[PDB]
Coordinates of all heavy atoms in Angstrom, one line a residue:
Chain A
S1 N 0.8 -1.2 0.0 CA -0.1 0.0 0.0 C 0.9 1.2 0.0 O 0.8 2.1 -1.0 CB -0.9 0.0 1.2 OG -1.6 1.3 1.3
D2 N 1.7 1.5 1.0 CA 2.6 2.6 1.1 C 3.6 2.5 -0.1 O 3.7 3.6 -0.8 CB 3.4 2.6 2.4 CG 2.5 2.9 3.7 OD1 1.5 3.6 3.5 OD2 2.8 2.4 4.7
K3 N 4.1 1.4 -0.4 CA 4.9 1.2 -1.6 C 4.1 1.5 -2.9 O 4.7 2.2 -3.7 CB 5.4 -0.2 -1.6 CG 6.5 -0.4 -2.8 CD 6.9 -1.9 -2.9 CE 8.0 -2.1 -3.8 NZ 9.3 -1.6 -3.4
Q4 N 2.9 1.0 -3.0 CA 2.1 1.3 -4.1 C 1.8 2.8 -4.3 O 2.0 3.4 -5.4 CB 0.8 0.6 -4.1 CG -0.2 0.7 -5.3 CD -1.3 -0.2 -5.2 OE1 -1.2 -1.5 -5.1 NE2 -2.5 0.4 -5.1
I7 N 5.1 4.5 -5.5 CA 5.4 4.2 -6.9 C 4.4 5.0 -7.8 O 4.7 5.4 -8.9 CB 5.4 2.7 -7.2 CG1 6.6 2.1 -6.5 CG2 5.5 2.5 -8.6 CD1 6.7 0.6 -6.6
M11 N 5.4 7.6 -10.7 CA 5.0 7.5 -12.0 C 4.2 8.7 -12.6 O 4.4 9.1 -13.7 CB 4.2 6.2 -12.2 CG 5.0 5.0 -12.3 SD 4.0 3.6 -12.6 CE 3.5 3.8 -14.4
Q37 N 7.2 2.9 -15.4 CA 6.9 2.1 -14.3 C 8.3 1.5 -13.8 O 8.6 1.6 -12.6 CB 6.0 1.0 -14.7 CG 5.8 -0.1 -13.6 CD 4.8 0.4 -12.6 OE1 3.6 0.6 -12.9 NE2 5.2 0.6 -11.3
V38 N 9.2 1.0 -14.7 CA 10.5 0.5 -14.3 C 11.3 1.5 -13.6 O 11.8 1.3 -12.5 CB 11.2 -0.1 -15.5 CG1 12.7 -0.4 -15.1 CG2 10.5 -1.4 -16.1
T41 N 9.9 2.4 -10.1 CA 10.2 1.3 -9.1 C 11.6 1.3 -8.7 O 12.0 1.2 -7.6 CB 9.6 0.0 -9.6 OG1 8.3 0.1 -10.0 CG2 9.8 -1.1 -8.6
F42 N 12.5 1.3 -9.7 CA 13.9 1.2 -9.4 C 14.4 2.4 -8.7 O 15.3 2.3 -7.8 CB 14.8 1.0 -10.7 CG 15.0 -0.5 -11.0 CD1 14.0 -1.1 -11.7 CD2 16.1 -1.2 -10.4 CE1 14.2 -2.5 -12.0 CE2 16.3 -2.5 -10.8 CZ 15.4 -3.1 -11.5
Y44 N 12.6 4.2 -6.4 CA 12.2 4.0 -5.0 C 13.2 3.0 -4.4 O 13.7 3.3 -3.3 CB 10.8 3.4 -5.0 CG 10.2 3.2 -3.7 CD1 9.7 4.1 -3.0 CD2 10.1 1.9 -3.1 CE1 9.1 3.9 -1.7 CE2 9.6 1.6 -1.9 CZ 9.1 2.7 -1.2 OH 8.4 2.5 0.0
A45 N 13.4 1.8 -5.0 CA 14.2 0.8 -4.3 C 15.6 1.2 -4.2 O 16.3 0.9 -3.2 CB 14.1 -0.6 -5.2
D46 N 16.2 1.9 -5.2 CA 17.6 2.2 -5.1 C 17.9 3.4 -4.2 O 18.9 3.4 -3.6 CB 18.1 2.6 -6.6 CG 18.2 1.3 -7.5 OD1 18.2 0.2 -7.0 OD2 18.3 1.6 -8.7
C48 N 16.1 3.6 -1.3 CA 16.2 2.9 -0.1 C 17.5 2.2 0.1 O 18.0 2.2 1.2 CB 15.0 1.8 -0.1 SG 15.2 0.7 1.3
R49 N 18.0 1.6 -0.9 CA 19.4 1.0 -0.8 C 20.4 1.9 -0.5 O 21.4 1.6 0.3 CB 19.6 0.2 -2.1 CG 18.7 -1.0 -2.3 CD 18.6 -1.5 -3.8 NE 19.7 -2.3 -4.2 CZ 20.5 -2.0 -5.1 NH1 20.5 -0.9 -5.7 NH2 21.5 -2.8 -5.4
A52 N 20.1 2.7 3.2 CA 20.4 1.6 4.0 C 21.9 1.3 4.0 O 22.2 0.4 4.8 CB 19.6 0.4 3.6
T53 N 22.7 1.9 3.1 CA 24.1 1.7 3.2 C 24.8 2.4 4.3 O 24.8 3.6 4.4 CB 24.7 2.0 1.8 OG1 24.2 1.3 0.8 CG2 26.3 1.9 1.8
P54 N 25.4 1.7 5.2 CA 26.1 2.4 6.4 C 27.1 3.5 5.8 O 27.9 3.2 4.9 CB 26.8 1.3 7.2 CG 25.9 0.1 6.9 CD 25.5 0.3 5.4
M95 N 23.7 4.5 -5.5 CA 23.8 3.2 -5.9 C 24.0 3.2 -7.5 O 23.5 4.1 -8.1 CB 22.5 2.4 -5.6 CG 22.2 2.3 -4.1 SD 23.4 1.4 -3.2 CE 24.4 2.7 -2.6
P96 N 24.8 2.2 -7.9 CA 24.9 2.1 -9.4 C 23.5 1.7 -9.9 O 22.7 1.0 -9.3 CB 25.9 0.8 -9.5 CG 26.7 0.8 -8.3 CD 25.7 1.3 -7.2
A99 N 21.3 -2.3 -12.8 CA 20.1 -3.1 -12.8 C 18.9 -2.5 -13.5 O 18.2 -3.0 -14.2 CB 19.8 -3.7 -11.4
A100 N 18.7 -1.2 -13.0 CA 17.7 -0.4 -13.7 C 18.0 -0.3 -15.3 O 17.0 -0.5 -16.0 CB 17.7 1.1 -13.1
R102 N 19.6 -2.4 -17.2 CA 19.2 -3.8 -17.8 C 17.7 -4.0 -17.8 O 17.2 -4.4 -18.9 CB 19.8 -4.9 -16.9 CG 21.3 -4.9 -17.0 CD 21.9 -6.1 -16.1 NE 22.9 -5.5 -15.1 CZ 22.6 -5.7 -13.8 NH1 21.5 -6.2 -13.3 NH2 23.5 -5.1 -13.0
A103 N 17.0 -3.5 -16.8 CA 15.5 -3.7 -16.9 C 14.9 -2.8 -18.0 O 14.0 -3.2 -18.7 CB 14.9 -3.2 -15.6
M106 N 15.2 -4.3 -21.6 CA 14.3 -5.3 -21.9 C 13.1 -4.7 -22.7 O 12.4 -5.4 -23.5 CB 13.6 -5.9 -20.7 CG 14.6 -6.8 -19.8 SD 15.4 -8.1 -20.8 CE 14.1 -9.1 -21.1
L107 N 12.8 -3.4 -22.5 CA 11.9 -2.6 -23.1 C 12.4 -1.7 -24.3 O 11.6 -1.4 -25.3 CB 11.1 -1.7 -22.2 CG 10.6 -2.4 -20.9 CD1 10.2 -1.4 -19.9 CD2 9.4 -3.2 -21.4
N140 N 9.0 7.6 5.3 CA 8.7 6.2 5.4 C 10.0 5.3 5.2 O 10.2 4.4 6.0 CB 7.7 5.9 4.4 CG 7.1 4.4 4.5 OD1 7.7 3.6 5.2 ND2 6.1 4.1 3.9
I141 N 10.8 5.7 4.2 CA 12.1 5.0 4.1 C 13.1 5.2 5.3 O 13.7 4.2 5.6 CB 12.7 5.4 2.8 CG1 11.8 4.8 1.6 CG2 14.1 4.8 2.6 CD1 12.2 5.2 0.2
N143 N 12.4 5.7 8.4 CA 11.9 5.0 9.5 C 12.1 3.5 9.3 O 12.5 2.8 10.3 CB 10.5 5.3 9.9 CG 10.3 6.7 10.2 OD1 11.2 7.5 10.8 ND2 9.1 7.3 10.0
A144 N 11.9 3.1 8.1 CA 12.0 1.7 7.8 C 13.6 1.2 7.8 O 13.8 0.2 8.4 CB 11.6 1.3 6.3
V145 N 14.5 2.1 7.3 CA 15.8 1.7 7.3 C 16.4 1.7 8.7 O 17.2 0.7 9.1 CB 16.7 2.7 6.5 CG1 18.1 2.6 6.8 CG2 16.5 2.3 5.0
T146 N 16.0 2.7 9.6 CA 16.7 2.7 10.9 C 15.8 1.8 11.8 O 16.4 1.0 12.5 CB 16.6 4.1 11.4 OG1 15.2 4.6 11.5 CG2 17.4 5.1 10.5
Chain B
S1 N 5.6 2.2 7.0 CA 4.9 1.3 7.9 C 4.9 -0.1 7.3 O 5.4 -1.1 7.9 CB 3.4 1.8 8.2 OG 2.7 0.7 8.9
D2 N 4.3 -0.3 6.1 CA 4.3 -1.5 5.4 C 5.8 -1.9 5.1 O 6.1 -3.1 5.3 CB 3.6 -1.3 4.1 CG 2.1 -1.1 4.2 OD1 1.5 -1.6 5.3 OD2 1.5 -0.4 3.4
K3 N 6.6 -1.0 4.7 CA 8.1 -1.2 4.5 C 8.7 -1.6 5.9 O 9.5 -2.5 5.9 CB 8.8 -0.1 3.9 CG 10.2 -0.3 3.5 CD 10.8 1.0 2.9 CE 12.2 0.7 2.3 NZ 12.0 0.0 1.0
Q4 N 8.4 -0.8 6.9 CA 8.9 -1.1 8.2 C 8.4 -2.5 8.7 O 9.3 -3.3 9.2 CB 8.4 0.0 9.2 CG 8.9 -0.3 10.7 CD 10.4 0.0 10.8 OE1 10.8 1.0 11.4 NE2 11.1 -1.0 10.4
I7 N 10.6 -5.1 6.8 CA 11.9 -5.2 7.2 C 12.1 -5.8 8.7 O 13.0 -6.5 8.9 CB 12.6 -3.8 7.2 CG1 12.8 -3.4 5.7 CG2 13.9 -3.8 7.9 CD1 13.4 -2.0 5.5
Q37 N 20.2 -6.2 10.0 CA 19.3 -5.1 9.5 C 19.6 -4.8 8.0 O 18.8 -4.6 7.3 CB 19.5 -3.8 10.4 CG 18.7 -2.6 10.0 CD 17.2 -2.8 10.3 OE1 16.8 -3.9 10.6 NE2 16.5 -1.7 10.4
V38 N 20.9 -4.6 7.7 CA 21.3 -4.3 6.4 C 20.9 -5.4 5.4 O 20.4 -5.2 4.4 CB 22.9 -4.1 6.3 CG1 23.3 -4.2 4.8 CG2 23.3 -2.8 7.0
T41 N 17.1 -5.2 4.8 CA 16.7 -4.1 3.9 C 17.0 -4.4 2.5 O 16.2 -4.2 1.6 CB 17.3 -2.9 4.5 OG1 17.0 -2.6 5.8 CG2 16.8 -1.6 3.7
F42 N 18.2 -4.9 2.3 CA 18.7 -5.1 0.9 C 17.9 -6.3 0.3 O 17.7 -6.3 -0.9 CB 20.2 -5.4 0.8 CG 21.0 -4.1 0.5 CD1 21.4 -3.3 1.6 CD2 21.2 -3.8 -0.8 CE1 22.0 -2.2 1.3 CE2 22.0 -2.6 -1.0 CZ 22.4 -1.8 0.1
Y44 N 14.7 -7.1 0.9 CA 13.4 -6.5 0.5 C 13.6 -5.7 -0.7 O 12.9 -5.9 -1.7 CB 12.9 -5.6 1.6 CG 11.5 -5.0 1.4 CD1 10.5 -5.7 1.7 CD2 11.4 -3.7 1.1 CE1 9.1 -5.2 1.5 CE2 10.2 -3.1 0.9 CZ 9.0 -3.8 1.1 OH 7.8 -3.3 0.9
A45 N 14.6 -4.7 -0.8 CA 14.7 -3.9 -2.0 C 15.1 -4.7 -3.2 O 14.5 -4.4 -4.3 CB 15.8 -2.8 -1.7
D46 N 16.0 -5.7 -3.1 CA 16.5 -6.4 -4.3 C 15.4 -7.4 -4.8 O 15.3 -7.7 -6.0 CB 17.8 -7.2 -4.0 CG 19.0 -6.2 -3.8 OD1 18.9 -5.0 -4.2 OD2 19.9 -6.6 -3.1
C48 N 12.2 -6.6 -4.6 CA 11.4 -5.7 -5.4 C 12.0 -5.4 -6.8 O 11.3 -5.5 -7.8 CB 11.3 -4.4 -4.7 SG 10.5 -3.1 -5.7
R49 N 13.3 -5.3 -6.8 CA 14.0 -5.0 -8.1 C 13.9 -6.2 -9.1 O 13.7 -6.0 -10.2 CB 15.4 -4.6 -7.9 CG 15.5 -3.2 -7.2 CD 16.8 -2.9 -6.4 NE 18.0 -2.7 -7.3 CZ 19.0 -3.4 -7.5 NH1 19.1 -4.5 -6.8 NH2 20.0 -3.0 -8.3
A52 N 10.4 -6.2 -10.5 CA 10.2 -5.1 -11.3 C 10.9 -5.2 -12.7 O 10.7 -4.3 -13.5 CB 10.6 -3.7 -10.7
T53 N 11.8 -6.2 -12.9 CA 12.5 -6.3 -14.1 C 11.7 -7.1 -15.1 O 11.2 -8.2 -14.9 CB 13.8 -7.1 -13.9 OG1 14.6 -6.3 -13.0 CG2 14.5 -7.3 -15.1
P54 N 11.4 -6.4 -16.3 CA 10.5 -7.1 -17.3 C 11.2 -8.4 -17.7 O 12.4 -8.5 -17.9 CB 10.5 -6.1 -18.4 CG 10.6 -4.8 -17.8 CD 11.6 -5.0 -16.6
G55 N 10.4 -9.5 -17.8 CA 10.9 -10.8 -18.1 C 11.6 -11.6 -17.1 O 12.0 -12.7 -17.3
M95 N 18.8 -10.4 -8.6 CA 19.7 -9.2 -8.7 C 21.1 -9.6 -8.2 O 21.1 -10.3 -7.1 CB 19.1 -8.1 -7.9 CG 17.8 -7.5 -8.5 SD 18.0 -6.8 -10.1 CE 17.5 -8.2 -11.1
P96 N 22.2 -9.1 -8.7 CA 23.4 -9.3 -8.0 C 23.3 -8.5 -6.6 O 22.7 -7.5 -6.6 CB 24.4 -8.5 -9.0 CG 23.8 -8.6 -10.3 CD 22.3 -8.5 -10.0
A99 N 25.8 -4.5 -4.2 CA 25.6 -3.3 -3.3 C 25.3 -3.8 -1.9 O 25.8 -3.2 -0.8 CB 24.4 -2.5 -3.7
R102 N 28.9 -4.7 -0.5 CA 29.6 -3.5 -0.1 C 29.1 -2.9 1.1 O 29.7 -2.4 2.0 CB 29.6 -2.4 -1.2 CG 30.4 -2.9 -2.5 CD 30.4 -1.8 -3.5 NE 29.1 -1.3 -3.9 CZ 28.5 -1.7 -5.0 NH1 29.0 -2.6 -5.8 NH2 27.3 -1.3 -5.3
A103 N 27.7 -2.9 1.3 CA 27.1 -2.4 2.5 C 27.5 -3.1 3.7 O 27.8 -2.6 4.8 CB 25.6 -2.4 2.4
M106 N 31.0 -2.4 5.2 CA 31.0 -1.2 6.1 C 31.0 -1.7 7.6 O 31.5 -1.0 8.5 CB 30.0 -0.3 5.8 CG 30.1 0.4 4.4 SD 31.6 1.4 4.2 CE 31.6 1.7 2.5
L107 N 30.3 -2.8 7.8 CA 30.2 -3.3 9.2 C 31.2 -4.4 9.5 O 31.7 -4.6 10.6 CB 28.8 -3.9 9.5 CG 27.7 -2.8 9.2 CD1 26.4 -3.5 9.2 CD2 27.7 -1.7 10.2
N140 N 2.3 -7.3 -1.5 CA 2.4 -5.9 -1.6 C 3.5 -5.6 -2.7 O 3.3 -4.6 -3.4 CB 2.9 -5.4 -0.2 CG 1.7 -5.0 0.6 OD1 0.6 -5.3 0.3 ND2 1.9 -4.3 1.7
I141 N 4.5 -6.3 -2.8 CA 5.5 -6.0 -3.8 C 4.9 -6.2 -5.2 O 5.0 -5.3 -6.1 CB 6.7 -6.8 -3.7 CG1 7.5 -6.5 -2.3 CG2 7.7 -6.7 -4.9 CD1 8.2 -5.2 -2.4
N143 N 1.8 -6.2 -6.2 CA 0.7 -5.1 -6.4 C 1.3 -3.8 -6.7 O 0.8 -3.1 -7.5 CB -0.3 -5.1 -5.2 CG -0.9 -6.5 -5.0 OD1 -1.1 -7.3 -5.9 ND2 -1.5 -6.7 -3.8
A144 N 2.3 -3.4 -6.0 CA 3.0 -2.1 -6.3 C 3.8 -2.1 -7.5 O 3.7 -1.1 -8.3 CB 4.0 -1.7 -5.1
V145 N 4.5 -3.1 -7.9 CA 5.3 -3.2 -9.0 C 4.6 -3.3 -10.3 O 5.0 -2.7 -11.3 CB 6.4 -4.3 -8.8 CG1 7.1 -4.6 -10.2 CG2 7.4 -4.0 -7.7
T146 N 3.5 -4.1 -10.3 CA 2.8 -4.3 -11.5 C 1.7 -3.1 -11.8 O 1.3 -2.5 -10.8 CB 2.0 -5.7 -11.4 OG1 2.8 -6.6 -11.0 CG2 1.4 -6.0 -12.8
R147 N 1.5 -2.9 -13.0 CA 0.7 -1.8 -13.4 C -0.6 -2.3 -14.2 O -1.7 -1.6 -14.3 CB 1.4 -0.8 -14.3

Side-chain angles (χ1 to χ4, degrees), chain A residues 1-4 7 11 37-38 41-42 44-46 48-49 52-54 95-96 99-100 102-103 106-107 140-141 143-146, chain B residues 1-4 7 37-38 41-42 44-46 48-49 52-55 95-96 99 102-103 106-107 140-141 143-146:
Chain A
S1 174
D2 294 330
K3 184 185 187 73
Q4 182 174 297
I7 293 179
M11 279 187 69
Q37 181 76 64
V38 166
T41 306
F42 269 89
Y44 183 80
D46 292 342
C48 170
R49 292 158 78 244
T53 296
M95 298 294 95
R102 292 180 237 115
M106 299 299 300
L107 306 168
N140 189 344
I141 292 176
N143 298 335
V145 158
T146 61
Chain B
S1 176
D2 296 330
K3 188 185 190 73
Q4 178 71 104
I7 292 179
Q37 180 75 344
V38 168
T41 305
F42 269 87
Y44 185 81
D46 292 340
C48 172
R49 291 157 77 243
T53 297
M95 297 294 95
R102 291 184 306 261
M106 296 296 169
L107 306 170
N140 269 14
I141 294 294
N143 299 336
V145 164
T146 311

